[PDB]
Amino acid sequence: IPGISLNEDNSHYFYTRAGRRLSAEEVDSWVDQYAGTQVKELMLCPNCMRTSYASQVWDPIWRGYDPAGPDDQPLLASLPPEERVAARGWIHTAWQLHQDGIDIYARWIRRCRQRGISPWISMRMNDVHYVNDERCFLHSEFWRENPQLRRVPYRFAEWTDRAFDYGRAEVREHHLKLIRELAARYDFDGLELDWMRFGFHFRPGYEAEGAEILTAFTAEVRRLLDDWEKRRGHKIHLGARIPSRPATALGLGMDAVTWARRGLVDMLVITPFWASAETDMPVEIWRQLLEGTGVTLAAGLEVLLRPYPDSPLFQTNSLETVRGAAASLLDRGAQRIYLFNYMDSQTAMEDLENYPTLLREIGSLETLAGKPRRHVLTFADTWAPGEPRAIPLPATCRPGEWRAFRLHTGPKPEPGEVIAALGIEGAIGPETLEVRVNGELCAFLGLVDLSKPRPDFPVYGFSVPLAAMRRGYNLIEVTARQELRFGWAEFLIRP
Amino acid sequence: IPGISLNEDNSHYFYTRAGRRLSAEEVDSWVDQYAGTQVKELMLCPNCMRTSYASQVWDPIWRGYDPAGPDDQPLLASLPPEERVAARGWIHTAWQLHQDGIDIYARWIRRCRQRGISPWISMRMNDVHYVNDERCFLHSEFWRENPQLRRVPYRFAEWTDRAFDYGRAEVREHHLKLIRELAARYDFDGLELDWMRFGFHFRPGYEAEGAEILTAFTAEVRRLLDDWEKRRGHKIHLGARIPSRPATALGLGMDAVTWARRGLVDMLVITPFWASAETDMPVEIWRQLLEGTGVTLAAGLEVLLRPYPDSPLFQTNSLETVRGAAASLLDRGAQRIYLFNYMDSQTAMEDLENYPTLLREIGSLETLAGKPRRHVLTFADTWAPGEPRAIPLPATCRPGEWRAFRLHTGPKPEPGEVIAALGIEGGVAIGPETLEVRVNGELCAFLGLVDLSKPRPDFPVYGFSVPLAAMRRGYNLIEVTARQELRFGWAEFLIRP
Ligand SMILES: O=C(CO)N[C@H]1[C@H]([C@H](O)[C@H](O)CO)O[C@](O)(C(=O)O)C[C@@H]1O
Ligand SMILES: O=C(CO)N[C@H]1[C@H]([C@H](O)[C@H](O)CO)O[C@](O)(C(=O)O)C[C@@H]1O
What we know:
2 copies of one chain form a homodimer.
Chain A: E1 4-8, H1 12-16, H2 24-32, E2 39-44, H3 81-99, H4 104-114, E3 118-124, H5 141-145, H6 169-185, E4 190-194, H7 207-232, E5 237-242, H8 246-251, H9 256-261, E6 267-270, H10 283-290, E7 296-301, H11 319-331, E8 336-339, H12 355-358, H13 365-368, E9 373-376, E10 395-397, E11 402-408, E12 417-425, E13 433-437, E14 440-441, E15 443-447, E16 459-463, E17 473-480, E18 484-494
Parallel strand pairs in A: 1-2, 1-8, 2-3, 3-4, 4-5, 5-6, 6-7, 7-8
Antiparallel strand pairs in A: 9-18, 10-18, 11-17, 12-16, 12-18, 13-14, 13-17, 15-16
Bound molecules: N-glycolyl-beta-neuraminic acid (2 copies).
């Protein structure tokens, strides 16, 4: 079966377990929820601009920390009073584990290997959370002291504006120092260069030179791990997270076809940044690009599910919507489903009771088969600077005009019900819309009470004749008698 | 050098030479203007829904024609009186040629090799001109009698709604009858399948089964040409015209990577349909996709240059703007520049005096190098039904907001002037500090209003002096912020040593 790669971020475990002395036994139990599922690999993130373990070459999260002191101390001063409580949870929990001689990543790796999971280290290569606050606890003293090493000096409109420029040798050396320590300190099966935090690593306009620079950096990483294979006596993998379309990937200085062909990486994770999980990604094109290279292609899901970038909705995926994306992507040739931000609490799916069910279904077409699923239209949140953007929603239809929406619904539906659903933003009757799926007339059903995630405007349901649906993309065509704007579209498949 | 491939359409010669009695010598003389140029292959197109030659298996353009009759005769009755004169120039020149025992395509093929040019035939697979007019002279009787074989029966909002559905067996057989006759009648160096007239071949939603079907159809074509290889005593090439981006090509049922890997085709032309040349096409991606297949990748240019699909401007490329596109696409790895609608008259660049210079320059970075060129921002006119569209212009900038435009300018600039030029739509006057323009992060000095040569917008264009050493090989980034709300309708890089 393809199976699941699940990412545990750098902060979550420390935020959620704060205020309790953690025993080695408890730390170990975290790995156990993942045993005997479709999870093949845990990607354990130990860093932002700072480490959550006791690094000797970077700043740990607790550098500057007074354990005994009040919340209002120099490290937390720049935060509002209530946000210091959460930040100090992370800082104090990670500190107290060090004090107790517990290395969390050393214990998780060891427990993974007992429970038949492959343990990975995922490194955040260029995290910029809260760089609007130059005094923030989670920035490195290296970032604070070296404003000249940033990507964009002439403006500050986005956090990525203040990310590090890997065009600079001092910047590449800074990140290679952590990878050198991480190789030494931890015997992991694989290192995953998480380029997708936050995906922007070069001066605007120098991305072509950047592609050469990143390919050369990757080669140095692979050479280092080749040396640790001998010391460690087992193969060590190298993977990377990159954008969802191949033109955007190259446009952000990530030429992965070259990394693959030169044998530098053996896994690639195509993924959005954050704003929504892309239900539509061109997997088939990447498979053709990567033919013969021995690289596993993983399709990355994010937790949010949102219809367009300006939407005020911030709801997460549900078991049904993840079943929809999983079936789609596996059908298109994904060799792994990768879950970022699907954790056991706080940053997680809102229907959390379904978590164990999810970890045992979405890694295979046979386990998803004949279970209800939802294929929601969304959008690509990440484009190279000045690259034309393609955003389906929202969509206006004037009187007598036609609008089409293609949605990837993966395997041909089993015997059962198929609904096409359309949310209208801003007053329709049953004859205002004519809806066809693959040419075929769909019967009006009336208003549909959607489970979360759902818009906050009316959703109208159309009955699709079962035999209309095909394998892969499905085409919703509509014409309106009155001017309307669409803000949501999905297929629901219910055997 | 990569060189040029140049497409002569099915109608143009007959339109422009109408009302002269043509001799064999004159007919031969057409090829001669392409001799001693960077043109390597003439793509000769003999068909729409009707052939311009005397077919035995399809309708010639003159089926139903009364040579002696008046303009107002059955074949032309459906047309406005003025439009009848031009239509009949096409029908009567193609008819008279046949009456005088001249097969125009036989003669062009022969002359081509006398002149060192490789001659190709280029078939239009699904032309739909004027299908709003059910009684139009240039439709096949097969098309008129078989409305059930069209793509879309539930509406007529575009010509492509009445295109044929290649998902049907009877449609494939109809187009395979023409290929079988073309391979028998003409000794060509290769056949091009022109899928991009007009690009839409399948019922909306069935493009996945369409891909499997067109791959098998391409496999039958290749197998048939393998047979003719032994009869003709030399190699016959098979090529196709496909969309500009791999996701759209597959979405319209064209899996060219499979055609290339299975050895079905040895040339692919990536191209827009019509509405504008694309100056930005992902050549480098296609090159990675086709690696190890020996397929010749050609970048197709169209004659129109327009900034956005809803623009009312209909101006053609200039020598400078083709220099621009050509340099960009070669720099990116195009193994040929392919010209569509760049004829010798009527359907032609507006600066026609510069056509001989064009056919001697755009074929190599060496012959383009140091020469004035323009790199204009446009748009891709063709997307798969319901595929989201990425259109850069027009672009609104609110006060203190930033907008970026990435323009592919191919080779680094030689010692000279580089200008970023930006057209502002609407009735709003800017000051010289209204805009802040950066290229690859570097400030560009306001130059004032630019008087662009055609093609150009009908709204003010402002020029910014780019520091030379800012510019890089490949994509170059324009970043703009405005102190007042503005809409951009035009962007370019002008590079003049
Ligand atoms: O906000 C929290 C928990 O309070 N953690 C966030 C977490 C957090 O801000 C970082 O781990 C800080 O280094 O960041 C992410 O992992 C992310 O980058 O997508 C999402 C997660 O919700
Ligand atoms: O309209 C005319 C004749 O004046 N020729 C047009 C020509 C013409 O309509 C067709 O050859 C008729 O089948 O079509 C094209 O080649 C085209 O498809 O882009 C354009 C060309 O300008």
